[PDB]
Ligand binder design. Sequence first.
Ligand SMILES: [Zn+2]
Ligand SMILES: [Zn+2]
Length: 184
Amino acid sequence: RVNEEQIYCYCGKPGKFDHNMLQCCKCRNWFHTQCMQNFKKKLLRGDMFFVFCCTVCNNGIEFVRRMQIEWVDVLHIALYNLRKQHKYHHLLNDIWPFILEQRHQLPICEKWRTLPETALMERLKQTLKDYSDRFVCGREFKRAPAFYALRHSGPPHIPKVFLEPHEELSDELLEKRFKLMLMP
Ligand SMILES: [Zn+2]
Ligand SMILES: [Zn+2]
Protein backbone atom coordinates (compact mmCIF):
# COMPACT_ATOMS: atom_id res chain seq x y z
CA ARG A 1 0.00 0.00 0.00
CA VAL A 2 2.52 2.54 1.11
CA ASN A 3 5.82 1.86 -0.45
CA GLU A 4 7.57 5.03 -1.36
CA GLU A 5 9.10 4.80 -4.74
CA GLN A 6 12.63 6.09 -4.59
CA ILE A 7 14.14 7.72 -7.68
CA TYR A 8 17.51 6.37 -8.80
CA CYS A 9 20.74 7.81 -10.15
CA TYR A 10 22.28 6.29 -13.29
CA CYS A 11 24.60 4.39 -10.96
CA GLY A 12 21.61 2.31 -9.91
CA LYS A 13 21.57 3.37 -6.26
CA PRO A 14 18.90 5.55 -4.60
CA GLY A 15 19.51 8.84 -2.78
CA LYS A 16 18.10 11.92 -1.06
CA PHE A 17 17.37 15.26 -2.73
CA ASP A 18 18.48 17.48 0.15
CA HIS A 19 21.59 15.34 0.58
CA ASN A 20 24.14 15.90 -2.20
CA MET A 21 21.97 15.33 -5.28
CA LEU A 22 21.41 17.54 -8.32
CA GLN A 23 18.94 17.41 -11.20
CA CYS A 24 20.06 17.89 -14.80
CA CYS A 25 18.37 20.84 -16.47
CA LYS A 26 18.09 19.13 -19.88
CA CYS A 27 17.25 15.45 -19.12
CA ARG A 28 15.71 16.14 -15.69
CA ASN A 29 17.34 13.04 -14.19
CA TRP A 30 18.79 13.05 -10.68
CA PHE A 31 22.48 12.44 -9.95
CA HIS A 32 24.65 11.75 -6.92
CA THR A 33 27.35 14.40 -6.67
CA GLN A 34 29.89 11.65 -6.28
CA CYS A 35 28.43 9.99 -9.36
CA MET A 36 29.19 13.27 -11.12
CA GLN A 37 32.49 14.20 -12.76
CA ASN A 38 34.65 16.41 -10.55
CA PHE A 39 32.01 17.54 -8.11
CA LYS A 40 33.57 17.16 -4.68
CA LYS A 41 32.20 19.75 -2.29
CA LYS A 42 30.50 19.17 1.01
CA LEU A 43 26.97 20.54 0.74
CA LEU A 44 24.87 21.91 3.57
CA ARG A 45 21.59 20.04 3.95
CA GLY A 46 19.02 21.69 1.70
CA ASP A 47 21.56 23.61 -0.34
CA MET A 48 20.95 22.76 -3.97
CA PHE A 49 21.49 26.16 -5.49
CA PHE A 50 23.20 25.01 -8.66
CA VAL A 51 22.50 24.75 -12.37
CA PHE A 52 23.52 21.30 -13.55
CA CYS A 53 23.75 19.63 -16.95
CA CYS A 54 25.11 16.09 -17.27
CA THR A 55 27.62 14.76 -19.79
CA VAL A 56 24.85 13.11 -21.81
CA CYS A 57 22.88 16.31 -22.37
CA ASN A 58 25.91 18.58 -22.71
CA ASN A 59 27.99 16.81 -25.37
CA GLY A 60 30.25 14.98 -22.91
CA ILE A 61 31.08 18.09 -20.90
CA GLU A 62 29.62 18.31 -17.39
CA PHE A 63 28.12 21.72 -16.65
CA VAL A 64 27.90 23.05 -13.10
CA ARG A 65 27.19 26.59 -12.03
CA ARG A 66 26.72 27.92 -8.52
CA MET A 67 23.72 30.22 -8.03
CA GLN A 68 23.92 33.54 -6.20
CA ILE A 69 21.54 33.32 -3.25
CA GLU A 70 19.68 35.85 -1.14
CA TRP A 71 19.35 36.20 2.64
CA VAL A 72 16.09 34.29 2.70
CA ASP A 73 17.95 31.34 1.20
CA VAL A 74 20.65 31.63 3.87
CA LEU A 75 18.03 31.80 6.62
CA HIS A 76 16.09 28.82 5.27
CA ILE A 77 19.33 26.84 4.98
CA ALA A 78 20.21 27.84 8.54
CA LEU A 79 16.85 26.83 10.02
CA TYR A 80 16.75 23.61 7.99
CA ASN A 81 20.16 22.36 9.12
CA LEU A 82 19.77 23.44 12.75
CA ARG A 83 16.27 22.11 13.50
CA LYS A 84 17.11 18.57 12.36
CA GLN A 85 18.14 20.38 16.93
CA HIS A 86 15.72 18.89 19.41
CA LYS A 87 10.79 23.89 18.62
CA TYR A 88 12.19 27.25 17.53
CA HIS A 89 15.59 28.84 17.34
CA HIS A 90 16.79 32.02 19.05
CA LEU A 91 17.91 34.55 16.43
CA LEU A 92 20.92 35.84 18.37
CA ASN A 93 21.89 32.54 20.01
CA ASP A 94 21.32 29.96 17.28
CA ILE A 95 20.70 31.56 13.89
CA TRP A 96 23.10 34.50 14.19
CA PRO A 97 26.22 32.46 15.01
CA PHE A 98 25.58 29.88 12.31
CA ILE A 99 25.28 32.39 9.48
CA LEU A 100 28.40 34.07 10.76
CA GLU A 101 30.18 30.74 10.64
CA GLN A 102 29.10 30.04 7.08
CA ARG A 103 29.11 33.54 5.66
CA HIS A 104 32.48 32.96 4.03
CA GLN A 105 31.26 29.75 2.44
CA LEU A 106 27.83 30.90 1.25
CA PRO A 107 27.34 31.95 -2.40
CA ILE A 108 26.36 35.59 -1.83
CA CYS A 109 27.50 38.96 -3.18
CA GLU A 110 30.50 40.79 -1.71
CA LYS A 111 28.21 43.45 -0.29
CA TRP A 112 26.39 40.79 1.73
CA ARG A 113 29.69 39.10 2.58
CA THR A 114 31.34 42.20 4.03
CA LEU A 115 28.23 43.79 5.52
CA PRO A 116 28.49 45.23 9.07
CA GLU A 117 26.90 43.09 11.79
CA THR A 118 24.37 45.66 13.05
CA ALA A 119 23.21 46.33 9.50
CA LEU A 120 23.17 42.57 8.97
CA MET A 121 20.95 42.00 12.01
CA GLU A 122 18.29 44.47 10.87
CA ARG A 123 18.43 43.07 7.34
CA LEU A 124 17.87 39.55 8.71
CA LYS A 125 15.05 40.70 11.00
CA GLN A 126 13.23 42.33 8.09
CA THR A 127 13.77 39.36 5.76
CA LEU A 128 12.13 37.05 8.28
CA LYS A 129 9.19 39.47 8.35
CA ASP A 130 8.88 39.77 4.57
CA TYR A 131 8.95 35.98 4.40
CA SER A 132 6.44 35.39 7.21
CA ASP A 133 4.92 32.73 4.96
CA ARG A 134 8.01 30.56 5.39
CA PHE A 135 9.10 31.67 8.83
CA VAL A 136 7.17 31.76 12.11
CA CYS A 137 8.19 34.35 14.67
CA GLY A 138 8.18 33.31 18.32
CA ARG A 139 8.04 35.53 21.40
CA GLU A 140 8.90 34.74 25.02
CA PHE A 141 6.76 35.92 27.93
CA LYS A 142 7.46 39.58 28.75
CA ARG A 143 10.23 39.52 26.14
CA ALA A 144 10.66 40.97 22.67
CA PRO A 145 10.35 38.23 20.05
CA ALA A 146 13.69 36.62 19.23
CA PHE A 147 12.57 33.20 18.04
CA TYR A 148 12.16 31.87 14.52
CA ALA A 149 11.23 28.59 12.88
CA LEU A 150 10.16 27.20 9.52
CA ARG A 151 6.37 27.27 9.26
CA HIS A 152 6.57 23.96 7.41
CA SER A 153 8.93 20.99 7.17
CA GLY A 154 10.23 21.59 3.65
CA PRO A 155 13.78 22.42 2.44
CA PRO A 156 14.84 25.78 0.88
CA HIS A 157 12.76 26.88 -2.07
CA ILE A 158 14.85 26.67 -5.21
CA PRO A 159 13.73 27.77 -8.70
CA LYS A 160 13.47 24.93 -11.22
CA VAL A 161 15.59 25.27 -14.34
CA PHE A 162 14.42 23.21 -17.32
CA LEU A 163 16.06 23.82 -20.69
CA GLU A 164 15.04 22.53 -24.10
CA PRO A 165 17.57 19.96 -25.39
CA HIS A 166 18.63 22.17 -28.32
CA GLU A 167 19.22 25.32 -26.26
CA GLU A 168 22.62 26.87 -25.54
CA LEU A 169 23.86 26.79 -21.95
CA SER A 170 25.02 30.40 -21.77
CA ASP A 171 24.93 32.27 -18.46
CA GLU A 172 23.21 34.98 -20.48
CA LEU A 173 20.28 32.69 -21.28
CA LEU A 174 19.91 31.45 -17.70
CA GLU A 175 19.70 35.03 -16.44
CA LYS A 176 17.32 36.24 -19.15
CA ARG A 177 14.94 33.28 -18.97
CA PHE A 178 14.95 32.19 -15.33
CA LYS A 179 15.83 35.49 -13.61
CA LEU A 180 18.82 33.86 -11.92
CA MET A 181 22.07 35.25 -10.55
CA LEU A 182 25.26 33.25 -11.00
CA MET A 183 28.37 33.36 -8.81
CA PRO A 184 31.53 34.37 -10.72
ZN1 LIG B 1 21.10 15.21 -18.62
ZN1 LIG C 1 24.57 7.88 -8.48
